[PDB]
Every structure is written in structure tokens, then in C-alpha cells.
Amino acid sequence: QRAKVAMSHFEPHEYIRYDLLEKNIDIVRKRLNRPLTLSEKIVYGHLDDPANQEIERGKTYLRLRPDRVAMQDATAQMAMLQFISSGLPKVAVPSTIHCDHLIEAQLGGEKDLRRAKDINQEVYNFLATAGAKYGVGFWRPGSGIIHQIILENYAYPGVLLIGTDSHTPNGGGLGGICIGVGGADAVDVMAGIPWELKCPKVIGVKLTGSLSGWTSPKDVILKVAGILTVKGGTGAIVEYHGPGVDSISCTGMATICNMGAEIGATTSVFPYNHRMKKYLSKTGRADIANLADEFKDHLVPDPGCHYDQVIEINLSELKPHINGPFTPDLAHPVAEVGSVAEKEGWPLDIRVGLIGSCTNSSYEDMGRSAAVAKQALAHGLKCKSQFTITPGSEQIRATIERDGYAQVLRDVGGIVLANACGPCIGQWDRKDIKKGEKNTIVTSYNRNFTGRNDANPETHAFVTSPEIVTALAIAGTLKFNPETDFLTGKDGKKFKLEAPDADELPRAEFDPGQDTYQHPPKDSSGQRVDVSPTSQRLQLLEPFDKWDGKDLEDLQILIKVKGKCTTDHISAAGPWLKFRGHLDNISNNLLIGAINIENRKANSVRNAVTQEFGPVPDTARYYKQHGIRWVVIGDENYGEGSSREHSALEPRHLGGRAIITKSFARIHETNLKKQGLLPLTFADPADYNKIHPVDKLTIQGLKDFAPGKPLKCIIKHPNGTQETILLNHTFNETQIEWFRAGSALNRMKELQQK
Numbered sequence: 244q245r246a247k248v249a250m251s252h253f254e255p256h257e258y259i260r261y262d263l264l265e266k267n268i269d270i271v272r273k274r275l276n277r278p279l280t281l282s283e284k285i286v287y288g289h290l291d292d293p294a295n296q297e298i299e300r301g302k303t304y305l306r307l308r309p310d311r312v313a314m315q316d317a318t319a320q321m322a323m324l325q326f327i328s329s330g331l332p333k334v335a336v337p338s339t340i341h342c343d344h345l346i347e348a349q350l351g352g353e354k355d356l357r358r359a360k361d362i363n364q365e366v367y368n369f370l371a372t373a374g375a376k377y378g379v380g381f382w383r384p385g386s387g388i389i390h391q392i393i394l395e396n397y398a399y400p401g402v403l404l405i406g407t408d409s410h411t412p413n414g415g416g417l418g419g420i421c422i423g424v425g426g427a428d429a430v431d432v433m434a435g436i437p438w439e440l441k442c443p444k445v446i447g448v449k450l451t452g453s454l455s456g457w458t459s460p461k462d463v464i465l466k467v468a469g470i471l472t473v474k475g476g477t478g479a480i481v482e483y484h485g486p487g488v489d490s491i492s493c494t495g496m497a498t499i500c501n502m503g504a505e506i507g508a509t510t511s512v513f514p515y516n517h518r519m520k521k522y523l524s525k526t527g528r529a530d531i532a533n534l535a536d537e538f539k540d541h542l543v544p545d546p547g548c549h550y551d552q553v554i555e556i557n558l559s560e561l562k563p564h565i566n567g568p569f570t571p572d573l574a575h576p577v578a579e580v581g582s583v584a585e586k587e588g589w590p591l592d593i594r595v596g597l598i599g600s601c602t603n604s605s606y607e608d609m610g611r612s613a614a615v616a617k618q619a620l621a622h623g624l625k626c627k628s629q630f631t632i633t634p635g636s637e638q639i640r641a642t643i644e645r646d647g648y649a650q651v652l653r654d655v656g657g658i659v660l661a662n663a664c665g666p667c668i669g670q671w672d673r674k675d676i677k678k679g680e681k682n683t684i685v686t687s688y689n690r691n692f693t694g695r696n697d698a699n700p701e702t703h704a705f706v707t708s709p710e711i712v713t714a715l716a717i718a719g720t721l722k723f724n725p726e727t728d729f730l731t732g733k734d735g736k737k738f739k740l741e742a743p744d745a746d747e748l749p750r751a752e753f754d755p756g757q758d759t760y761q762h763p764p765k766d767s768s769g770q771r772v773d774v775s776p777t778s779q780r781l782q783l784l785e786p787f788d789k790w791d792g793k794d795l796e797d798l799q800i801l802i803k804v805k806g807k808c809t810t811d812h813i814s815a816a817g818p819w820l821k822f823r824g825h826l827d828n829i830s831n832n833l834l835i836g837a838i839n840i841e842n843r844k845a846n847s848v849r850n851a852v853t854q855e856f857g858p859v860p861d862t863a864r865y866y867k868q869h870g871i872r873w874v875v876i877g878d879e880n881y882g883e884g885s886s887r888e889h890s891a892l893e894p895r896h897l898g899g900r901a902i903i904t905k906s907f908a909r910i911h912e913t914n915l916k917k918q919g920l921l922p923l924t925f926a927d928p929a930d931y932n933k934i935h936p937v938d939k940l941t942i943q944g945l946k947d948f949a950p951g952k953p954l955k956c957i958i959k960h961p962n963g964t965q966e967t968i969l970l971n972h973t974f975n976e977t978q979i980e981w982f983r984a985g986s987a988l989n990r991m992k993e994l995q996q997k
């Protein structure tokens with residue numbers, strides 16, 4: 244580039260290329276002759292061939308070149324095992340591993356981390372020596388959650404980042420396009436080959452007016468999530484714009500982009516502005532803010548660009564929301580929630596109040612919560628409810644500890660957890676409740692899907708802002724309304740809580756703490772990564788079987804699924820995170836949470852040959868070792884939610900050939916195409932009703948599988964009648980070559996020594 248500004252302090256040699264962004268935006272622009280939106284300037288500015296790429300929103304696959312790859316340890320292990328199979332010597336672009344998902348919340352900060360490094364040494368040692376070997380930066384356990392460390396250090400305006408985690412959109416708060424992928428996508432960018440993405444549609448949310456009072460950043464996406472619903476953002480990028488953007492802090496925009504994951508959006512973004520500039524300078528990147536000022540025309544949307552849908556939100560009319568309890572789109576005003584809770588039968592007293600995680604742990608969030616706490620403390624009050632605080636990184640922990648906020652928070656009765664996901668992925672040894680107990684918890688997190696936080700099917704969880712969690716934690720009930728109600732203080736008077744007052748960013752500079760990162764040695768020609776042969780936590784992958792040239796005849800339906808089938812129903816987390824690097828050991832959880840439409844129950848399907856109802860993994864394994872190939876039938880938005888490729892690998896490992904649904908979630912359908920399976924959808928969703936558990940399916944037409952040709956499916960009924968239905972697919976020729984080879988990895992290996 245002419246300027247020589249680095250990507251971050253950890254890669255001082257790898258410079259930001261806004262000169263290329265601009266050259267590819269100018270090549271696209273003159274092919275398209277129209278204003279482009281911000282996410283179009285940034286996506287199309289990273290095309291591998293901007294002169295020739297075919298560009299149509301919602302239709303074409305763009306072949307893109309991401310700037311950096313970030314990985315989290317619950318998904319980094321399988322991604323690094325696939326990279327190890329490619330045979331390639333080093334990673335092609337800046338990648339980092341972050342160790343945040345294997346640390347269980349039990350007693351608090353220090354004790355929980357000590358136990359996690361003991362319990363997990365094998366996997367942390369595997370991730371660091373493979374990181375050292377292949378040149379991947381490694382953030383040590385206890386250093387912080389992937390998105391918080393990415394916002395503090397690696398996101399910048401104009402970046403195209405991919406991450407093996409759904410909440411990777413978080414990065415959009417600093418003006419970049421950050422997309423979550425399954426681990427095999429990350430190994431394409433690390434292997435140095437173009438990354439493909441279905442060309443996004445763009446939803447424009449216009450922000451007008453200003454935040455006031457108890458209303459925070461969080462409220463905007465709780466409001467938008469309820470307007471669009473979980474199905475709302477599928478296949479689109481949400482792009483925030485308006486005069487109101489500049490009334491939100493940089494870490495508030497990151498809160499909003501983060502939860503856009505919850506409506507199925509490919510990612511969300513905000514346009515570069517003064518708030519981002521301020522945060523870039525206060526986090527040791529003033530030079531990035533100076534470069535970006537010079538390229539600002541390319542980091543804002545063109546005037547007059549066309550959004551495929553515009554939603555307008557008046558921030559000055561906005562008021563606090565609390566969303567739940569079993570989806571993030573059931574939206575409520577914090578004024579109404581008490582009411583709805585008594586008519587609906589949701590438990591009114593707040594058992595546990597949990598604040599933090601990467602969605603709501605900025606210096607501003609911790610401070611606004613303390614500003615509430617300090618008030619309750621001046622009246623001899625304490626949290627009525629149990630109270631946990633998870634700092635997003637060691638820098639937010641060291642900084643808020645030093646400036647006092649952490650001590651206010653413990654003085655009202657909260658325990659500070661390790662800087663890791665913990666209760667946000669449900670990695671938590673809970674004790675206050677017997678399992679099955681019906682109880683309400685309230686979090687500042689993002690997802691509140693059933694069983695997400697403690698695996699109690701009946702814990703009702705509500706997501707809101709950290710200050711409202713803190714206020715309701717002292718209150719102990721969903722009946723309390725912070726902005727109206729009175730609280731009875733130890734000295735018998737009544738008083739009411741004042742709306743939080745707090746610094747956006749420190750007066751001082753940020754404390755980073757010590758010992759957080761392991762640099763890779765461009766040295767150690769002689770790093771050795773050794774999966775013990777009979778290790779129960781890590782296992783080297785063995786190639787899947789190449790496609791046999793024939794059609795798929797008389798396939799068994801392992802399960803026909805009723806309703807919502809999230810990737811947590813397909814591959815659960817909780818106890819199974821200890822097997823995220825062992826494929827046959829984590830496959831023993833295949834589809835155990837999905838509801839069987841035959842009997843309305845989870846984990847009991849009928850074995851076609853023994854005629855006994857029993858566990859799905861056992862049955863799929865019975866089928867596999869007897870030569871029966873099977874299929875799953877789903878309803879809508881199948882594979883919704885968490886990014887894990889384990890949802891696609893475990894079907895392949897047990898004998899699965901195809902998943903046919905009315906519609907798929909984006910990251911799960913890419914993960915099925917990547918593992919050699921067939922993601923297919925009904926040309927008519929009503930055809931879901933034609934297929935019963937008992938039928939055998941023949942998927943015919945593979946010999947001339949082509950983009951756009953539907954595949955024909957012959958349903959064969961026990962009584963000899965058959966029906967033929969049509970099935971659509973979104974494969975392009977790159978992806979058909981993945982199916983043909985047995986998986987995308989097998990194909991990457993054929994472009995070397997076959």
C-alpha cells in the first residue's frame with residue numbers, strides 16, 4: 244500500500260490494504276453503475292476477481308479473500324485437525340485461537356480457571372503447539388472471550404474477518420464485515436484458497452433521535468429482533484445508518500451487531516464514525532483511525548444506496564426491553580414484563596442475575612451497572628438475587644478492577660467469574676435449583692433458547708441490558724420496573740433508582756494485564772503436535788468415502804423431525820464440549836434433542852429392522868454397520884443457531900447421506916455441503932406431509948447434478964404406491980465437486996497429489 248500501517252500490534256508486518264479495497268470498489272462500481280451500501284463496498288472490495296465476479300443479491304456466490312481468521316477453542320480443535328490433514332505447512336493469513344469455551348463456572352474467577360487448565364491440559368497443549376507450528380497466534384485460557392479480544396485488538400473498519408462462532412458479527416461495531424463460519428471455511432482461508440459466500444441481501448435499519456435514560460444499545464436489537472423474528476435476517480446483512488448512529492458508543496454498536504446473529508443475519512455493520520475513532524485511539528490503534536479517516540468515503544455507504552428492506556427506529560422514543568423467555572424475539576417493554584409474567588405463568592422472583600459475556604461487558608456496561616449498584620449500596624441494600632459478572636477480557640477485568648467498578652459489584656453480592664463464556668454457552672455447575680425446577684434467570688447475554696444456560700428445560704431466561712439485570716437483581720422480581728418503582732431501603736425510607744450515569748471509555752488508559760498471549764515462533768522448524776493414539780479428547784480425522792457414482796436408492800429415514808431443530812438439538816454442548824476434537828466420541832450425541840414426529844419425544848426412534856424404539860445414535864450406528872444409508876427430514880430453519888460443524892460431521896460419520904428440509908440455516912447448510920452430505924429442500928413445503936417414517940426415499944439425478952436443476956425424489960410407501968416429488972438445492976459447481984470427492988477436504992487434497 245503507499246501507507247504502511249499494521250493490522251494489529253501482533254502482526255506488525257502485515258499491513259492494512261485500503262488501497263486494494265478502493266481499487267476493487269472502483270472496478271465494481273463501474274460495472275454496476277449504482278450506489279453501493281457499506282456492506283457492499285466492503286464485501287465487493289474483497290472479491291478475488293472484481294472485474295469478472297458475477298454479482299446479484301441473494302443469487303450468486305461471491306468468491307472472497309478474508310483478511311484474518313479467528314477461532315474459539317470449542318471449534319478450533321476440529322478446524323486445526325482438518326488443517327493438519329491438508330498437509331499444508333503454515334497458515335496463509337493471520338489466524339488466532341482463543342481459549343474461552345472450556346472453562347466452567349462454579350466458584351468464581353481464579354478457582355474456576357485453575358481447575359479448567361488442569362481438567363483441559365491436553366487440549367490447551369494441543370492448540371498451542373499446533374498454533375506455534377502452523378503460525379497461529381494463541382490467546383491463553385483466562386485471557387478473554389473471542390469477540391471481546393477481537394474488538395479490542397483485531398477488528399478495524401473495512402476488515403473482512405471470518406470466525407468459527409456465530410457471534411462473530413460482534414466485529415461490525417468497529418465497521419468491519421465479520422462473518423461466522425464452520426471450521427472447514429476457516430481452513431479454506433488458512434489454506435489460501437478463495438472463500439465463497441452467497442451474495443447477501445441488505446436490510447437497512449435507520450436510527451434517528453438519541454438514547455436516554457435506562458435505554459441502552461442492547462434495546463435497539465431487542466426491538467429489531469422482535470420486529471424481524473429469528474427468521475427475519477436470513478440471507479441478509481443488517482446495515483445500521485441514520486443521524487442516530489453517532490449517539491451510540493463503539494462497544495454499543497458491537498452489542499447490536501452481536502445479537503443480529505439471533506435473527507439469522509449473515510452479519511451486521513455500522514459505518515465508520517467518530518465513536519469508532521475514539522475507541523480505536525483509546526485501544527492503542529490511533530494510527531488505524533488516522534488511515535481510516537483518509538479512506539472514509541469507502542467506509543460509509545454511498546448516498547442514495549438501496550436497501551432491500553428499511554426499518555426505522557426512533558431511539559428517543561426507545562424504552563428498555565427484556566426479551567424471552569424461550570426465544571430472543573419474544574420482545575417486552577420492561578414496564579410490561581411483570582404483568583405478562585403473571586398472565587402467562589412465568590416465575591416472578593429472579594433466581595440468578597448474570598451480567599457480562601462478550602455481548603455486554605464493555606467498560607461502559609460494567610460502569611453503568613456499578614452506577615446502579617453504588618445507589619443500592621448507599622441505602623444498605625444488596626442483591627436479593629444471586630448475581631454473576633463475567634468480564635469479557637483480562638483487559639476489562641484488570642481495568643474495571645483498578646477503577647473500582649469490580650469492588651462495587653462484589654459489595655452488592657456478585658461473584659466475578661473467569662473471563663470466559665461459562666453460563667453463556669451453558670458451561671456452568673449450577674446449584675441453587677433442583678433439575679426440572681421452574682425458575683427465572685435474567686441475563687445480559689444474547690441467546691435464551693431452552694436449556695442454553697443450565698440445561699434445565701424449564702429455566703425461563705430473559706435477556707436485557709446489564710444495568711437492568713443489576714436493577715432487577717437487587718429487586719429480586721420481574722415485577723420491578725426500575726424507571727418507575729420505589730425500593731424499600733434498610734433504613735425504612737422509599738427512594739428510586741436513578742438512571743445510570745457512566746464514562747464511555749476510561750479517563751485513564753486501559754490496563755491489559757499480564758501473560759495473555761503466546762506469539763508463534765517463525766522459528767521452531769521442529770514443533771511437533773502429537774495426538775496420543777488412544778486419546779479420548781482428540782482424534783485425527785480419517786477421510787470420508789468418495790461418492791460412488793450411483794444414485795441414492797432406498798434410503799431409510801432415521802428421524803422425521805417435528806418443529807424447530809437447532810444445532811444444539813443436533814450436537815449438544817454441555818458435557819459434550821469435552822469431545823469437540825474426538826469425532827466418534829461426540830457422535831454419540833447425534834440428534835438426541837430433536838422431537839421425533841412419530842411419538843413427540845426426544846431420542847427415541849424406531850429401528851426399522853428390530854422394531855424397537857431406542858436412542859438415535861445407537862440406531863444410526865446400527866444402520867451404518869448393517870449397510871443401511873439414511874436421511875433426516877426436517878421442518879423450517881433447520882440447523883438454526885450455533886456454528887459447530889459437528890452438526891454436519893456426526894451425520895456423515897454415522898451413515899447419513901442427505902438432510903431434506905423445508906429450509907436451512909446458512910452456516911449449517913454450508914457445513915453439510917462441506918462434509919459431502921446433501922442439503923435438500925422441498926420444492927413444495929407441503930411435501931413434508933407426504934413423507935412418513937416408514938417410507939424409503941430414492942434421490943435420483945446425481946449423475947447430472949447441476950446448478951439450478953432440481954433433484955427428483957421417489958417416495959416408496961409400504962403398500963407399493965410411490966410418489967415423486969422435486970427437491971431444490973443451492974449447490975454451484977464448486978460445491979458439487981465437494982460432494983463428488985466425499986467432502987471439501989478430500990477435494991482440496993485432489994488439487995495437489997490427488
Ligand SMILES: O=C(O)CC(CC(=O)O)C(=O)O
Pocket residue numbers: 301441442443477478479509909973
Ligand atoms: O436460500 C439460499 O440459497 C441460502 C440463504 C442464506 C445464505 O447463504 O445467504 C439465502 O440466500 O437466503
Ligand code: F3S
Pocket residue numbers: 343388389390408410600601602663664667668688689
Ligand atoms: S463468544 Fe460470546 S455470545 Fe456467549 S458463548 Fe461466548 S460469551
